[model samples]
Target: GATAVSEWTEYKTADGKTYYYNNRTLESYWEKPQELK
Candidate 1:
């Protein structure tokens, strides 16, 4: 895979779905990313 993890960012689908990208792990997720209070 000739992908750059650092270039990855939060993106949205055509259907308005949101996804979060992980630079270190090079992964994406449909669920919400972690938050701090």
Candidate 2:
């Protein structure tokens, strides 16, 4: 199967909402990207 697995930055908001970030950075690569709100 032609599938791609991507890493995401998991975060829990105040309302119990989770967020995922998919980007490469100095501190965080595909394992962990930056978050913007």
Off by over 4 Å in 1: 1-8, 35-37
lDDT of 1 by residue, 1-37 (tens): 3444444467888989888776667878777544300
lDDT of 2 by residue, 1-37 (tens): 1223344456567987665555553243323333332
Candidate 2 local Cα displacement, residue 5, angstroms: 8.8
Lowest-lDDT window of 10 residues in candidate 2?
28-37
TM-score, cand. 2 vs. native: 0.36
